[PDB]
Amino acid sequence: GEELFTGVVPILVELDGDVNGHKFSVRGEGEGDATNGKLTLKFICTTGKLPVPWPTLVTTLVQCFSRYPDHMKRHDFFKSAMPEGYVQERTISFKDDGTYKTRAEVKFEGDTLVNRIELKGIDFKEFGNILGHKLEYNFNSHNVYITADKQKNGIKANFKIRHNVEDGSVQLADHYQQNTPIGDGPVLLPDNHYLSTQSVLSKDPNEKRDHMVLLEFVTAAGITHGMDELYK
Ligand code: NA
Ligand code: NA
């Protein structure tokens, strides 16, 4: 599994969404460099204007590209499930607002890592921060807290995204996550740990379509056994 991620790997992302009955599609393309934990993608709304803010889709739009330190290689569920891949599900609860439910398959198709997603959003406030587009076009750094789920031969994760709001307030989005392998084979079931994630959103000044350019870094941490020799 891990050997598939040496070097730079092309990435395809496809999302079909329905938020409060507003249907939309997103296509993303780019590269991941798991040795450096680096992602670079560009996303387009293929159906017109995106009816929610781009930042609210970042977490949904490939944690197999995390850089796991050498002393933690045996806790990398995501790569261990490759190439057959895994199913990733979330509930994303926007504080004082609606909910996204997402289901994704993350897997290799040839040499390409593909993330194919269905997203359903309900109970959003028509004039709230999301459907009213009051979120700033930026992103904070976050930790993703991971635990094994032996019963499903996979993992769970929990975290809270903080979305800056135009009025200086913060919009919280609580994430609950479950991943399960697509194949029947063994996977690595990790000890508790987390992914440290950083993101930068930008625009392509030559792009006329509704879009998002994304740079992300992801690195795993939170297991310290055993790194003694690395200090000197
Ligand atoms: Na990194
Ligand atoms: Na955090």
161: CA distance to ligand 2 center in Å? 7
Q: Concatenated DSSP letters for 25-69?
A: EEEEEEEEETTTTEEEEEEEETTSS-SS-GGGGTTT--GGG-B--
Asked whether 123 and 98 are in contact (CB, 8 A), the reply is yes
48: CA distance to ligand 1 center in Å? 34
CA pair distance 1, 84, nearest whole angstrom: 9
72: CA distance to ligand 2 center in Å? 20
Give 34's Cβ-side CA count (13 Å radius): 25
Contacting residues for 94 by C-beta, under 8 A, at least 6 apart: 56, 100, 124, 129, 130, 171, 172, 173
β-bridge partners, 103:
89, 118
- The helix/strand/coil state of 108 is strand
The H or E element spanning position 79 is helix 77-80
Asked whether 14 and 46 are in contact (CB, 8 A), the reply is no
Which approach determined this entry? X-ray
Strand 170-181 vs strand 86-94: parallel, antiparallel, or unpaired? antiparallel
Nearest CA-CA partner of 174 in 116, 93, 120, 105:
93
State residue 194 phi and psi, 5-degree precision: -140, 160
CA pair distance 152, 141, nearest whole angstrom: 29
144: CA distance to ligand 2 center in Å? 7
208: CA distance to ligand 2 center in Å? 33
In this structure, what token pair is assigned to residue 109? 């198709």
CA pair distance 97, 89, nearest whole angstrom: 20
Question: Which parts of the chain are beta strand (E)?
Answer: 9-19, 22-33, 38-45, 86-94, 99-109, 112-122, 142-149, 154-164, 170-181, 193-202, 211-221
What would be the CATH architecture of the domain defined by 1-232? Beta Barrel (2.40)
Asked whether 170 and 162 are in contact (CB, 8 A), the reply is yes
197: CA distance to ligand 2 center in Å? 9
Resolution in A: 1.9
Each domain of the chain, given as residue ranges in start order, spans: 1-232
In this structure, what token pair is assigned to residue 104? 């994704």
